[PDB]
Short mmCIF file of all heavy atoms in Angstrom, two decimals:
data_model
loop_
_atom_site.label_atom_id
_atom_site.label_comp_id
_atom_site.label_asym_id
_atom_site.label_seq_id
_atom_site.Cartn_x
_atom_site.Cartn_y
_atom_site.Cartn_z
N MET C 117 28.21 10.94 9.52
CA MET C 117 27.11 11.06 10.51
C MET C 117 27.46 10.23 11.75
O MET C 117 26.92 10.55 12.83
CB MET C 117 25.82 10.59 9.83
CG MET C 117 24.62 10.40 10.73
SD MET C 117 23.12 9.96 9.79
CE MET C 117 23.32 10.90 8.27
N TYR C 118 28.32 9.21 11.61
CA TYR C 118 28.70 8.31 12.73
C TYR C 118 30.22 8.20 12.94
O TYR C 118 30.60 7.44 13.86
CB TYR C 118 28.10 6.93 12.47
CG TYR C 118 26.60 6.89 12.59
CD1 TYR C 118 25.81 6.71 11.48
CD2 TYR C 118 25.98 7.09 13.81
CE1 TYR C 118 24.43 6.69 11.58
CE2 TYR C 118 24.60 7.06 13.93
CZ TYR C 118 23.82 6.86 12.81
OH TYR C 118 22.46 6.84 12.90
N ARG C 119 31.08 8.90 12.19
CA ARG C 119 32.55 8.69 12.33
C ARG C 119 32.91 8.98 13.79
O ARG C 119 32.48 10.03 14.30
CB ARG C 119 33.41 9.51 11.36
CG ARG C 119 33.27 11.02 11.45
CD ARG C 119 34.12 11.61 10.34
NE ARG C 119 34.00 13.05 10.19
CZ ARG C 119 34.65 13.77 9.29
NH1 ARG C 119 35.33 13.19 8.32
NH2 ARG C 119 34.63 15.09 9.36
N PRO C 120 33.67 8.11 14.48
CA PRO C 120 33.94 8.30 15.91
C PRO C 120 34.78 9.55 16.19
O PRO C 120 34.48 10.23 17.15
CB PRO C 120 34.74 7.06 16.31
CG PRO C 120 34.49 6.06 15.20
CD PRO C 120 34.31 6.91 13.96
N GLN C 121 35.80 9.82 15.37
CA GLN C 121 36.75 10.93 15.65
C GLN C 121 36.01 12.27 15.74
O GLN C 121 36.26 12.99 16.71
CB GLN C 121 37.85 10.98 14.58
CG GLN C 121 37.35 10.96 13.14
CD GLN C 121 38.45 11.26 12.16
OE1 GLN C 121 39.44 10.54 12.07
NE2 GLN C 121 38.28 12.33 11.40
N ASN C 122 35.14 12.59 14.78
CA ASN C 122 34.38 13.86 14.76
C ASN C 122 33.07 13.62 14.01
O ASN C 122 32.98 14.02 12.84
CB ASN C 122 35.20 15.01 14.18
CG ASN C 122 35.78 14.73 12.82
OD1 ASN C 122 35.61 13.64 12.27
ND2 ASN C 122 36.48 15.70 12.26
N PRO C 123 32.05 12.99 14.62
CA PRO C 123 30.85 12.67 13.87
C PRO C 123 30.22 13.96 13.34
O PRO C 123 29.91 14.81 14.16
CB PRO C 123 29.96 11.96 14.90
CG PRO C 123 30.49 12.41 16.24
CD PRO C 123 31.98 12.60 16.02
N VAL C 124 30.05 14.08 12.03
CA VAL C 124 29.40 15.27 11.40
C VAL C 124 28.02 14.82 10.91
O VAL C 124 27.96 14.12 9.88
CB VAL C 124 30.23 15.83 10.23
CG1 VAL C 124 29.56 17.04 9.59
CG2 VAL C 124 31.64 16.17 10.66
N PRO C 125 26.92 15.20 11.58
CA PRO C 125 25.60 14.74 11.19
C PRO C 125 25.18 15.49 9.92
O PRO C 125 24.76 16.62 10.03
CB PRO C 125 24.73 15.09 12.40
CG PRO C 125 25.39 16.32 12.98
CD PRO C 125 26.87 16.10 12.73
N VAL C 126 25.29 14.85 8.76
CA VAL C 126 24.98 15.48 7.45
C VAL C 126 23.50 15.22 7.21
O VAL C 126 23.04 15.52 6.11
CB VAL C 126 25.86 14.93 6.33
CG1 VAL C 126 27.32 15.25 6.55
CG2 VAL C 126 25.67 13.43 6.12
N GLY C 127 22.79 14.69 8.20
CA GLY C 127 21.36 14.39 8.08
C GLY C 127 20.50 15.51 8.62
O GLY C 127 19.51 15.82 7.95
N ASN C 128 20.86 16.13 9.74
CA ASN C 128 20.00 17.16 10.39
C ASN C 128 20.32 18.55 9.86
O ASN C 128 19.40 19.38 9.80
CB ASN C 128 20.19 17.14 11.90
CG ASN C 128 19.93 15.77 12.49
OD1 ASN C 128 18.84 15.23 12.35
ND2 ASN C 128 20.93 15.21 13.13
N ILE C 129 21.58 18.80 9.48
CA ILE C 129 22.02 20.13 8.98
C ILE C 129 21.22 20.46 7.73
O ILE C 129 20.76 21.60 7.60
CB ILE C 129 23.52 20.10 8.66
CG1 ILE C 129 24.37 19.80 9.89
CG2 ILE C 129 23.95 21.38 7.97
CD1 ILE C 129 25.82 19.53 9.58
N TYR C 130 21.06 19.49 6.83
CA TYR C 130 20.37 19.69 5.54
C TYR C 130 18.90 20.04 5.75
O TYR C 130 18.45 20.99 5.10
CB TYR C 130 20.42 18.38 4.77
CG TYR C 130 19.88 18.45 3.37
CD1 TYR C 130 20.41 19.33 2.45
CD2 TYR C 130 18.87 17.61 2.96
CE1 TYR C 130 19.93 19.39 1.16
CE2 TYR C 130 18.37 17.66 1.67
CZ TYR C 130 18.91 18.55 0.77
OH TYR C 130 18.44 18.62 -0.51
N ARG C 131 18.19 19.24 6.55
CA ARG C 131 16.76 19.45 6.87
C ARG C 131 16.54 20.89 7.32
O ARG C 131 15.57 21.47 6.86
CB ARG C 131 16.36 18.51 8.00
CG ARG C 131 16.40 17.05 7.57
CD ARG C 131 16.46 16.02 8.66
NE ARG C 131 15.23 15.93 9.43
CZ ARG C 131 15.15 16.12 10.74
NH1 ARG C 131 16.03 16.87 11.37
NH2 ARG C 131 14.15 15.58 11.41
N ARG C 132 17.36 21.38 8.25
CA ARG C 132 17.30 22.76 8.75
C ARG C 132 17.23 23.74 7.58
O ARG C 132 16.40 24.66 7.63
CB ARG C 132 18.55 23.01 9.58
CG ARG C 132 18.53 24.27 10.41
CD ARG C 132 19.86 24.39 11.13
NE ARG C 132 20.10 23.25 11.99
CZ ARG C 132 21.21 23.03 12.70
NH1 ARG C 132 22.27 23.80 12.53
NH2 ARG C 132 21.26 22.03 13.55
N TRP C 133 18.08 23.55 6.57
CA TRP C 133 18.14 24.45 5.40
C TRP C 133 16.84 24.36 4.62
O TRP C 133 16.32 25.41 4.19
CB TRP C 133 19.30 24.05 4.51
CG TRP C 133 20.65 24.02 5.16
CD1 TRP C 133 20.97 24.37 6.44
CD2 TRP C 133 21.88 23.60 4.55
NE1 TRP C 133 22.31 24.20 6.66
CE2 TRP C 133 22.89 23.73 5.52
CE3 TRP C 133 22.22 23.13 3.29
CZ2 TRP C 133 24.22 23.40 5.25
CZ3 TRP C 133 23.53 22.81 3.02
CH2 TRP C 133 24.51 22.94 3.99
N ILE C 134 16.38 23.13 4.40
CA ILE C 134 15.12 22.88 3.65
C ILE C 134 14.02 23.64 4.38
O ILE C 134 13.18 24.19 3.69
CB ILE C 134 14.72 21.40 3.58
CG1 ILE C 134 15.88 20.41 3.50
CG2 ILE C 134 13.76 21.17 2.43
CD1 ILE C 134 16.83 20.66 2.37
N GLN C 135 14.06 23.66 5.71
CA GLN C 135 12.98 24.26 6.53
C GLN C 135 12.91 25.78 6.37
O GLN C 135 11.86 26.33 6.67
CB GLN C 135 13.16 23.90 8.00
CG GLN C 135 12.73 22.48 8.31
CD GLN C 135 12.78 22.16 9.78
OE1 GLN C 135 13.13 23.00 10.60
NE2 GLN C 135 12.41 20.94 10.12
N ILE C 136 13.99 26.43 5.94
CA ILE C 136 14.02 27.90 5.75
C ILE C 136 13.36 28.22 4.41
O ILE C 136 12.71 29.26 4.33
CB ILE C 136 15.47 28.42 5.83
CG1 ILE C 136 16.12 28.02 7.16
CG2 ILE C 136 15.52 29.91 5.60
CD1 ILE C 136 17.61 28.26 7.19
N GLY C 137 13.55 27.37 3.39
CA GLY C 137 12.89 27.52 2.08
C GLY C 137 11.40 27.26 2.22
O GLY C 137 10.63 28.10 1.72
N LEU C 138 11.02 26.21 2.94
CA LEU C 138 9.59 25.89 3.20
C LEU C 138 8.95 27.06 3.93
O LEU C 138 7.84 27.47 3.54
CB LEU C 138 9.51 24.66 4.11
CG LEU C 138 9.38 23.30 3.44
CD1 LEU C 138 10.68 22.86 2.83
CD2 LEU C 138 8.92 22.27 4.46
N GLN C 139 9.64 27.61 4.93
CA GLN C 139 9.09 28.68 5.79
C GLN C 139 8.85 29.95 4.97
O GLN C 139 7.79 30.56 5.14
CB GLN C 139 10.00 28.97 6.97
CG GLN C 139 9.85 27.95 8.09
CD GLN C 139 10.81 28.20 9.23
OE1 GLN C 139 11.59 29.15 9.20
NE2 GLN C 139 10.74 27.35 10.23
N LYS C 140 9.77 30.31 4.08
CA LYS C 140 9.61 31.52 3.24
C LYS C 140 8.36 31.38 2.38
O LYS C 140 7.63 32.37 2.27
CB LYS C 140 10.76 31.64 2.25
CG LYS C 140 12.10 32.03 2.85
CD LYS C 140 13.25 31.78 1.89
CE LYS C 140 13.00 32.33 0.51
NZ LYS C 140 12.75 33.78 0.54
N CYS C 141 8.14 30.21 1.80
CA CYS C 141 6.97 29.96 0.92
C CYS C 141 5.68 30.15 1.69
O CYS C 141 4.76 30.80 1.16
CB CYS C 141 6.96 28.51 0.49
SG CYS C 141 8.53 27.93 -0.19
N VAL C 142 5.63 29.62 2.90
CA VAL C 142 4.43 29.76 3.77
C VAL C 142 4.19 31.25 3.93
O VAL C 142 3.02 31.68 3.85
CB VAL C 142 4.71 29.11 5.13
CG1 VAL C 142 3.70 29.52 6.18
CG2 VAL C 142 4.81 27.60 5.03
N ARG C 143 5.27 32.02 4.09
CA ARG C 143 5.17 33.48 4.29
C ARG C 143 4.76 34.10 2.96
O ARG C 143 4.06 35.11 3.00
CB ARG C 143 6.49 34.07 4.75
CG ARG C 143 6.36 35.49 5.26
CD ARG C 143 7.64 35.95 5.92
NE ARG C 143 8.74 35.85 4.99
CZ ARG C 143 9.80 35.06 5.14
NH1 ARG C 143 9.75 34.01 5.94
NH2 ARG C 143 10.90 35.31 4.46
N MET C 144 5.18 33.53 1.84
CA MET C 144 4.81 34.04 0.50
C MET C 144 3.36 33.67 0.22
O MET C 144 2.79 34.26 -0.73
CB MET C 144 5.72 33.42 -0.55
CG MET C 144 7.10 34.02 -0.58
SD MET C 144 8.10 33.53 -2.01
CE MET C 144 7.30 32.01 -2.53
N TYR C 145 2.77 32.75 0.99
CA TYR C 145 1.38 32.27 0.78
C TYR C 145 0.46 32.57 1.96
O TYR C 145 -0.48 31.78 2.14
CB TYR C 145 1.35 30.76 0.57
CG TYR C 145 2.15 30.20 -0.57
CD1 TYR C 145 3.02 29.15 -0.37
CD2 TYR C 145 1.96 30.63 -1.86
CE1 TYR C 145 3.74 28.59 -1.41
CE2 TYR C 145 2.67 30.09 -2.92
CZ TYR C 145 3.56 29.06 -2.69
OH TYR C 145 4.27 28.51 -3.73
N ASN C 146 0.71 33.60 2.78
CA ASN C 146 -0.27 34.00 3.82
C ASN C 146 -1.20 34.94 3.04
O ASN C 146 -0.85 36.12 2.86
CB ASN C 146 0.33 34.56 5.12
CG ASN C 146 1.47 35.54 4.94
OD1 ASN C 146 1.32 36.58 4.30
ND2 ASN C 146 2.61 35.23 5.52
N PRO C 147 -2.36 34.46 2.55
CA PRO C 147 -3.21 35.27 1.67
C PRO C 147 -3.56 36.59 2.34
O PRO C 147 -3.65 37.59 1.64
CB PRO C 147 -4.46 34.40 1.48
CG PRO C 147 -4.46 33.50 2.68
CD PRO C 147 -2.99 33.19 2.87
N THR C 148 -3.75 36.57 3.66
CA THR C 148 -4.10 37.78 4.44
C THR C 148 -2.94 38.16 5.35
O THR C 148 -2.45 37.26 6.07
CB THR C 148 -5.35 37.51 5.28
OG1 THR C 148 -5.06 36.46 6.20
CG2 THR C 148 -6.54 37.11 4.44
N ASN C 149 -2.50 39.41 5.32
CA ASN C 149 -1.46 39.89 6.26
C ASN C 149 -2.22 40.18 7.56
O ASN C 149 -3.43 40.49 7.45
CB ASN C 149 -0.64 41.04 5.70
CG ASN C 149 0.04 40.69 4.40
OD1 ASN C 149 -0.09 39.57 3.91
ND2 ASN C 149 0.77 41.64 3.83
N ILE C 150 -1.61 40.05 8.74
CA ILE C 150 -2.31 40.22 10.05
C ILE C 150 -2.95 41.60 10.19
O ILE C 150 -3.93 41.71 10.96
CB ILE C 150 -1.37 39.95 11.24
CG1 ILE C 150 -0.09 40.79 11.19
CG2 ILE C 150 -1.05 38.47 11.33
CD1 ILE C 150 -0.19 42.09 11.93
N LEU C 151 -2.42 42.62 9.51
CA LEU C 151 -2.92 44.01 9.61
C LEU C 151 -4.22 44.13 8.81
O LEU C 151 -4.88 45.18 8.92
CB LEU C 151 -1.85 44.94 9.05
CG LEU C 151 -0.59 45.11 9.89
CD1 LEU C 151 0.34 46.11 9.25
CD2 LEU C 151 -0.95 45.55 11.29
N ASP C 152 -4.57 43.10 8.04
CA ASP C 152 -5.78 43.09 7.19
C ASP C 152 -6.81 42.10 7.74
O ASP C 152 -7.93 42.07 7.19
CB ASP C 152 -5.42 42.66 5.78
CG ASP C 152 -4.51 43.64 5.06
OD1 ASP C 152 -4.93 44.80 4.90
OD2 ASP C 152 -3.41 43.24 4.67
N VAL C 153 -6.44 41.30 8.73
CA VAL C 153 -7.38 40.33 9.37
C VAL C 153 -8.22 41.18 10.31
O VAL C 153 -7.62 41.75 11.25
CB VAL C 153 -6.63 39.21 10.10
CG1 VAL C 153 -7.59 38.24 10.77
CG2 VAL C 153 -5.68 38.47 9.18
N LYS C 154 -9.51 41.32 10.05
CA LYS C 154 -10.38 42.20 10.86
C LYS C 154 -11.71 41.48 11.08
O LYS C 154 -11.80 40.31 10.72
CB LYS C 154 -10.57 43.53 10.14
CG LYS C 154 -9.29 44.12 9.57
CD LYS C 154 -9.47 45.47 8.93
CE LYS C 154 -8.16 46.01 8.41
NZ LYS C 154 -8.34 47.30 7.71
N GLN C 155 -12.71 42.18 11.61
CA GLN C 155 -14.02 41.57 11.93
C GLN C 155 -15.11 42.28 11.13
O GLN C 155 -15.14 43.53 11.16
CB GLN C 155 -14.21 41.66 13.44
CG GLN C 155 -15.31 40.77 14.00
CD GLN C 155 -15.27 40.77 15.51
OE1 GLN C 155 -14.43 41.41 16.13
NE2 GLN C 155 -16.20 40.05 16.13
N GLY C 156 -15.97 41.53 10.43
CA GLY C 156 -17.09 42.09 9.66
C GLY C 156 -18.34 42.08 10.52
O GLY C 156 -18.24 41.60 11.66
#
Side-chain angles (χ1 to χ4, degrees):
Chain C
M117 169 176 325
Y118 291 111
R119 60 184 174 180
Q121 50 170 61
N122 53 359
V124 180
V126 296
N128 304 301
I129 298 170
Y130 186 58
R131 293 161 69 239
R132 192 182 300 176
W133 303 358
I134 325 305
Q135 283 186 0
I136 303 169
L138 266 75
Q139 281 177 1
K140 288 165 49 58
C141 309
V142 165
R143 193 170 58 243
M144 284 191 339
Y145 302 129
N146 44 59
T148 63
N149 302 0
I150 54 92
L151 289 183
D152 295 300
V153 179
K154 315 183 179 177
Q155 195 171 359

